[PDB]
Amino acid sequence: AAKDVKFGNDARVKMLRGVNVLADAVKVTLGPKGRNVVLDKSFGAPTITKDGVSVAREIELEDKFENMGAQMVKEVASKANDAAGDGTTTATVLAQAIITEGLKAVAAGMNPMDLKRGIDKAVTAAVEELKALSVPCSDSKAIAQVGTISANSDETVGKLIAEAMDKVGKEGVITVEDGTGLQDELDVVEGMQFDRGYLSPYFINKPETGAVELESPFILLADKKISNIREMLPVLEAVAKAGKPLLIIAEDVEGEALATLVVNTMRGIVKVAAVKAPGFGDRRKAMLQDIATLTGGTVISEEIGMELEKATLEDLGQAKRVVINKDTTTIIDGVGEEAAIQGRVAQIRQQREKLQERVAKLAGGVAVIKVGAATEVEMKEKKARVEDALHATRAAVEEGVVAGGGVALIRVASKLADLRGQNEDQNVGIKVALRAMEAPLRQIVLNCGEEPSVVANTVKGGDGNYGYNAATEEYGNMIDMGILDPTKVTRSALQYAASVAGLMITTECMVTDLP
Amino acid sequence: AAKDVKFGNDARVKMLRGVNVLADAVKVTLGPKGRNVVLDKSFGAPTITKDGVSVAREIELEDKFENMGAQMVKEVASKANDAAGDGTTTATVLAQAIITEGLKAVAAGMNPMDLKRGIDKAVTAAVEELKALSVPCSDSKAIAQVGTISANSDETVGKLIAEAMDKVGKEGVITVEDGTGLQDELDVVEGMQFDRGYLSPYFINKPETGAVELESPFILLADKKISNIREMLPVLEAVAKAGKPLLIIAEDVEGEALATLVVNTMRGIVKVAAVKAPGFGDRRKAMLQDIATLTGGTVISEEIGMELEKATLEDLGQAKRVVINKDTTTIIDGVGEEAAIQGRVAQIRQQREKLQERVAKLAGGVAVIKVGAATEVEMKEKKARVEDALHATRAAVEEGVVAGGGVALIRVASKLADLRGQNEDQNVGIKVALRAMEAPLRQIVLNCGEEPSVVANTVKGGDGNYGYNAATEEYGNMIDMGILDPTKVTRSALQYAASVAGLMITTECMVTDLP
Amino acid sequence: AAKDVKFGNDARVKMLRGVNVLADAVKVTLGPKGRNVVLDKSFGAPTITKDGVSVAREIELEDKFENMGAQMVKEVASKANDAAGDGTTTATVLAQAIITEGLKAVAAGMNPMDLKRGIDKAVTAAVEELKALSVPCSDSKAIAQVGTISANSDETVGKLIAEAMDKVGKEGVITVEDGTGLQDELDVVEGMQFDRGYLSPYFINKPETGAVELESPFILLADKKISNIREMLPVLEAVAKAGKPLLIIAEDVEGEALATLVVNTMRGIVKVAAVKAPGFGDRRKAMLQDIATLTGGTVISEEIGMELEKATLEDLGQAKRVVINKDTTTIIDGVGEEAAIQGRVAQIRQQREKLQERVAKLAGGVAVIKVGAATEVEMKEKKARVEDALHATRAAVEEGVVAGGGVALIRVASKLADLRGQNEDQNVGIKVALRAMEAPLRQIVLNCGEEPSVVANTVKGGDGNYGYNAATEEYGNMIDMGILDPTKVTRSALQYAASVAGLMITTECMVTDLP
Amino acid sequence: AAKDVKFGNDARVKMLRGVNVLADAVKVTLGPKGRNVVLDKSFGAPTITKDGVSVAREIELEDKFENMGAQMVKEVASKANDAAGDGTTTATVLAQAIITEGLKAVAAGMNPMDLKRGIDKAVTAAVEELKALSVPCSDSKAIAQVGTISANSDETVGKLIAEAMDKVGKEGVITVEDGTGLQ
């Protein structure tokens, strides 16, 4: 189609208007005196939601340029979510702030590509500074801490999470299943989790989680690449008449057999899914046997001659459940003998870090959680927030908590008061990020109907963990008042907003379709 | 789609206009000198109706923002209805009142989120105060009392209801069936009711009640979850050629067998429905056997080996009728032997509160009512109002009656004259609810063509149960004049209006589709 | 859809405009110097008609509010017709009059709901007063009297009607069939009529009468409810190959067998119809046997074991004709033996009021009428007017005649000159009905091109039955000049107009779809 | 001419919008980090000015009601000027503040004529209190100071006026005209 092209200031004013519409809709939900947004859906009833990414994903504008603005910032809130699990509003609010302040400088005659270098440097430093402040996140306290936070105040949540890790460890494998009743349930049962995602978004049966939940399925363990679909029918027809679903772990699954399986589930007979075997080369040889042992199945190897055509139900493994998402597969309760698994444990124990990881995965079991609730809505809803929190937590653990209320950010801004760049434009670029670092605190206060600059002035008069408690309307030590954000989320908010807004301010020309 | 977004006052003026259109259409029906509203329906002839929720559910506006207003208040009238069975107009009128007064304060510079806290506190207190005033609702008087009221003055109604409970008790199980002739009929026959709703709105054969009525059907009693549909065909084909419908009680029915059954009734051969078995864990084991005994059927247990494939008609139970709705299942006249049921009674009697509940349900029978009427219209129409009243009554019983004419509300408003909050905005928020509490009385009077403030002044000059009798145009003791509202309804009106309007006034921005 | 809502005066001016358009189109046909209205019909040729209801049923307006006006008054003319058979124009003209005068008072500041109470009281009194004036309608004179009138002057009509009743009695059963030639024919033959209408408007084969005429059909007499259609095929296939139609009398016919039969006639093989058996309980047991005896059929009882599957043609009854309408079934010329019927007569004669009614129906036969005519048009047309008249007559008999020219009404208006209500608004409400009572006379005169108020003044100067003879243009005694209206029609006109217009004037708000 | 008449809240929202436009244009010049306003004049070249009354006298709005708002507050800045000679911006900024806060209370259900009595009483008291705080101002140093702040922080103008009053006396006149040179 013929394109519309806009230059310089015009392009930019439009781009910003876009950002604002999205930013403004997301902002209203930030903080304890945050309000909700209603999101239409022809489909079913509207949705009420506080969740920043959820509002973001729905904004699309009519003016094609404004649209482009919104479609870009939408990525910060989106990315935050995939990494952290929370902070998507904060992320958005920082991004809008850097942009506003950025473009103001660009309009001053500053060189955008330098303003960007400044912003980026300011951020690399803020990230370092946050690692310092974080206390870390180790003890079950900090854990249920961050958890309950990312779970949105709900302490019961951060709780189970801490308990969980406190059971199978910080690296243990935790999962989530809908609760049968009103009570939450944490159980440890014979499992494993590895870093492999689905081979097609078309296997998703739970659109909500964006995941693949399968009920007591068989597991196929193939050593070769799967291109042709002919060697599938002997087994794929035996598990058709067994009523149950089927999981495929192989070197890969190529377009030919994949695309047939893809349309074979959605709209099709047997509902199945497939994922690449973990690791590569010599690891996946033994790493795949690990799964075989756990599930009580057989590995179809090429070096023994075994082919897929010469395989039965008996050769397959089994579990009571399994969940696959974008990049994670986790199996729960393997039918594998206690003798067989313990035998393979002693085998590796005998056999230093890479073998240690295989022991940890295997010996070890998988912890499960059943989100209890009164209503099926809340139920599955709560279940959601859980998986979220869990995320941040794992991340929080890997890299802790910091003072909430966005004080952490305000604190790093004064530490970097003396940061400079290679030239004056880079300097303004730093001051632009620092000034933005105040925005979460500033929005939190503004959503309470209170003077945001007056609160900020007095928090900035303080030190360490002194902050504003928006709930109770009085100042104090944020960690003592239990207002903690997880470090991974605060960091991640910052990195992502900076990344997008950094690029965004360097825009001199925009190219889109005609109205 | 591209969205329209409106801020602050503009958003709010539009939101209110919406509320008014709906409120105004509902208001005209409040009280004894209430008039009717005509509701178009391409479908059949138009509908004449006084029933507040019925008017509400039809309002949809063209201006997309105004629409949003109306679509939200529509929920108070809707919620009132699902809980109470009456008071939907009152509910609506209170909601419109809180909103009007609210937004006026918001426009004064008050902090909405505080006005909300005030309103809410004022309400929590009004609810307490109403519990005090209620006399309760216990004696068959108060019962037929509230009944006849919620039935819309019709004394004959409140009557049978009192009789009913007076038969199988307040907790007894009462049902309703269309009358064969012109006479009402109350009969007690060999039944049970438990807290479980249909597994899909697609089983509804009576669109009016929003329920599932089934004629002398067989009952299937399964101990396991029902996912696959293959174990269904041996029995589902034997009851296909028996001409009769079939009820399924199992641990659950999963999408796979559910979705097949769903399209198998509407547009399909055998008309069936399914509901989850009552309770959970060890209760539903024996609780399901209770039903088996009553219906003269067999429980298909897993721990005995019995599967659904190895089951006949003989294994199934039977009743003369059964009605399922949103969250209630009730079976009527079980074919179960008098010996078998009495034997199971003595079994539990031997076996303290949870077992007591199972005795009550079982021993005991189910009372039925046949709404008599001249015309089939009135007939089924009257039948409706009945089920309504019955509701409120059960509720009234659980938590009585209060002075009608909306005097109860006016009375609690003076009791709370001294209620205060945490700050001045919270105070205005209280005064806003109190002032609203006068509105039902004020509308009742306004629908009579009389001076509403002059009536209110003089009712507020009085005490206790002194009120205005709009029918006869003179003041007096409302309980003595027989003008009683059920407590549960007055309470419920208030709680729901407050809930919605409370949220509504905190609105600073609105996001909808383009015109 | 988005709705338009109008308030107060605006709503009302529009509502009235609607009424007028319909009223004005109907008015032009009132009285002996009434003119015709032409009614388009894409379908066939246009229709010329004097018949008030026929004009009414065609008015639909474009302005959605005006439409609502017309769609409401349309009900008076419609209701008149269903009860009386005549007077539909009068009804309409009164209704328009009450409305006009009403709304004028509402605009004076009067309280509508009181104006209504007045109107209603004035009417309850006018009805009483008319019962007084009626002379009654008993002798064959008054009968052919009212008949010939409601038949529109046609004396030949009122004639046969009187003859008829003079044959099988006032309660005898009279029917109508198209005439074979040009001569009218009255014949008495071996029949019965009971108060039961068709079980679906979809059995109608004569769209004109809105009835179900069936030619020498078989009669099925079932004791049970008919839900399933399987027990139908043994008999329904034997009467398929007998070429003739089939009538079903049973306890009921439920949706399942009904909906199959419904589409099985229109668009289908065997043309059949079904009606509920007369009475209830113990009556319908013997009351159904009565029909069996008359038709020479067998009753398929449950208490003998007989099922519908085990039934032949031989078991069924037969008649030469049968007509079913909205609420009446009447069978004509039963094949039942003279011995069998006389035997059942002696059986009941032996066996006090309820058994007396069964004797009357049975012993007794059914009188038939064949409307003779030159053209098939006139023929079937005349046939129509007949059935009409017959109606009013039966009614006239049950509750006589009064002075035509609308003098009766003018006479009751002076009798009620001293009627008062509970307050002044109720008083105006009475004067509003009284003043309206003059309108028929006033329109009759206006359609003659003469001064309506001058005629009215001089009729009101007179007494008793003195009136204006519009045909001959001179005053006199209306009963002596043969200008009589039947009481039932005059009463019914009044009651219905009052009913609708009473409601209509209480309208403060109107809600409809957007243009 | 036919008149437009507006009531209650509508009248008031419009009246306020008027006040704001004038207030906002005058406000930007208040204080040492005050900026200038440019005032068109078909007549000659435009005028640059910091002087609050000068901006005020030029505001006239198109919406006839908003106009009325502005035309009324314009009188505070105008009156200040005729009496004092300075403070016209301050005057304007106070006036806009009382109004904003006032109308907010009126919208709360307060009785306007009482809000007025309060305001007036508060002011009669503030005037008394200021008489107290004032230290008289009689020494050349103090005089030079008011002069300086008046002249947007220009020490020379202060000094120059202080010197002037010192020489002519109290019962003596000082005029100001265009000079030839730069100083």
PDB file of C-alpha atoms in Angstrom, chain C residues 44-110:
ATOM      1  CA  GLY C  44     -53.571 -10.210  -3.846  1.00  0.00           C
ATOM      2  CA  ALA C  45     -55.892  -7.391  -4.897  1.00  0.00           C
ATOM      3  CA  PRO C  46     -56.585  -4.708  -2.323  1.00  0.00           C
ATOM      4  CA  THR C  47     -59.446  -5.150   0.086  1.00  0.00           C
ATOM      5  CA  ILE C  48     -62.370  -2.825   0.473  1.00  0.00           C
ATOM      6  CA  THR C  49     -63.771  -2.943   4.010  1.00  0.00           C
ATOM      7  CA  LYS C  50     -66.061  -1.183   6.510  1.00  0.00           C
ATOM      8  CA  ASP C  51     -64.935  -3.438   9.365  1.00  0.00           C
ATOM      9  CA  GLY C  52     -63.180  -1.403  12.029  1.00  0.00           C
ATOM     10  CA  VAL C  53     -60.827  -4.050  13.372  1.00  0.00           C
ATOM     11  CA  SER C  54     -59.655  -4.800   9.841  1.00  0.00           C
ATOM     12  CA  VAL C  55     -58.521  -1.240   9.256  1.00  0.00           C
ATOM     13  CA  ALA C  56     -56.942  -1.185  12.757  1.00  0.00           C
ATOM     14  CA  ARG C  57     -54.773  -4.296  12.369  1.00  0.00           C
ATOM     15  CA  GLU C  58     -53.092  -2.649   9.320  1.00  0.00           C
ATOM     16  CA  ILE C  59     -51.986   0.621  10.841  1.00  0.00           C
ATOM     17  CA  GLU C  60     -48.269   0.745  11.668  1.00  0.00           C
ATOM     18  CA  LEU C  61     -46.496   4.089  11.633  1.00  0.00           C
ATOM     19  CA  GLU C  62     -42.982   5.169  10.776  1.00  0.00           C
ATOM     20  CA  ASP C  63     -42.264   7.491  13.699  1.00  0.00           C
ATOM     21  CA  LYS C  64     -41.522   4.955  16.332  1.00  0.00           C
ATOM     22  CA  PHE C  65     -43.363   6.748  19.150  1.00  0.00           C
ATOM     23  CA  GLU C  66     -46.477   7.494  17.109  1.00  0.00           C
ATOM     24  CA  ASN C  67     -46.321   3.825  16.250  1.00  0.00           C
ATOM     25  CA  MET C  68     -46.547   2.930  19.926  1.00  0.00           C
ATOM     26  CA  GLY C  69     -49.670   5.046  20.293  1.00  0.00           C
ATOM     27  CA  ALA C  70     -51.372   3.247  17.408  1.00  0.00           C
ATOM     28  CA  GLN C  71     -50.139  -0.179  18.447  1.00  0.00           C
ATOM     29  CA  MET C  72     -51.828   0.211  21.816  1.00  0.00           C
ATOM     30  CA  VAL C  73     -55.307   1.499  20.865  1.00  0.00           C
ATOM     31  CA  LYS C  74     -55.210  -1.174  18.195  1.00  0.00           C
ATOM     32  CA  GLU C  75     -55.888  -3.512  21.113  1.00  0.00           C
ATOM     33  CA  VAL C  76     -59.290  -2.129  22.001  1.00  0.00           C
ATOM     34  CA  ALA C  77     -60.602  -2.730  18.453  1.00  0.00           C
ATOM     35  CA  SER C  78     -58.889  -6.051  18.539  1.00  0.00           C
ATOM     36  CA  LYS C  79     -60.296  -7.155  21.894  1.00  0.00           C
ATOM     37  CA  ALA C  80     -63.836  -5.942  21.121  1.00  0.00           C
ATOM     38  CA  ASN C  81     -63.708  -8.182  18.064  1.00  0.00           C
ATOM     39  CA  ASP C  82     -62.659 -11.355  19.959  1.00  0.00           C
ATOM     40  CA  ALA C  83     -65.380 -11.015  22.562  1.00  0.00           C
ATOM     41  CA  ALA C  84     -68.305  -9.297  20.856  1.00  0.00           C
ATOM     42  CA  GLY C  85     -67.804  -9.763  17.079  1.00  0.00           C
ATOM     43  CA  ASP C  86     -68.897  -6.159  16.387  1.00  0.00           C
ATOM     44  CA  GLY C  87     -68.574  -2.672  17.858  1.00  0.00           C
ATOM     45  CA  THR C  88     -64.821  -2.518  17.080  1.00  0.00           C
ATOM     46  CA  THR C  89     -65.210   0.905  15.514  1.00  0.00           C
ATOM     47  CA  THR C  90     -67.297   2.169  18.449  1.00  0.00           C
ATOM     48  CA  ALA C  91     -64.740   0.766  20.842  1.00  0.00           C
ATOM     49  CA  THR C  92     -62.019   2.615  18.903  1.00  0.00           C
ATOM     50  CA  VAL C  93     -63.903   5.886  18.852  1.00  0.00           C
ATOM     51  CA  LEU C  94     -64.563   5.823  22.597  1.00  0.00           C
ATOM     52  CA  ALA C  95     -60.925   4.984  23.264  1.00  0.00           C
ATOM     53  CA  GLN C  96     -59.726   7.907  21.223  1.00  0.00           C
ATOM     54  CA  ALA C  97     -62.119  10.131  23.118  1.00  0.00           C
ATOM     55  CA  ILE C  98     -61.191   9.148  26.604  1.00  0.00           C
ATOM     56  CA  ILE C  99     -57.483   9.608  25.603  1.00  0.00           C
ATOM     57  CA  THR C 100     -57.955  13.025  24.070  1.00  0.00           C
ATOM     58  CA  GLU C 101     -59.900  14.244  27.073  1.00  0.00           C
ATOM     59  CA  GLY C 102     -57.651  12.502  29.546  1.00  0.00           C
ATOM     60  CA  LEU C 103     -54.396  13.976  28.238  1.00  0.00           C
ATOM     61  CA  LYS C 104     -56.035  17.374  28.229  1.00  0.00           C
ATOM     62  CA  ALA C 105     -56.649  16.995  31.960  1.00  0.00           C
ATOM     63  CA  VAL C 106     -53.147  15.645  32.572  1.00  0.00           C
ATOM     64  CA  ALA C 107     -51.928  18.819  30.955  1.00  0.00           C
ATOM     65  CA  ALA C 108     -54.085  20.736  33.460  1.00  0.00           C
ATOM     66  CA  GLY C 109     -51.992  19.414  36.343  1.00  0.00           C
ATOM     67  CA  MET C 110     -54.373  16.608  37.326  1.00  0.00           C
TER      68      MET C 110
END
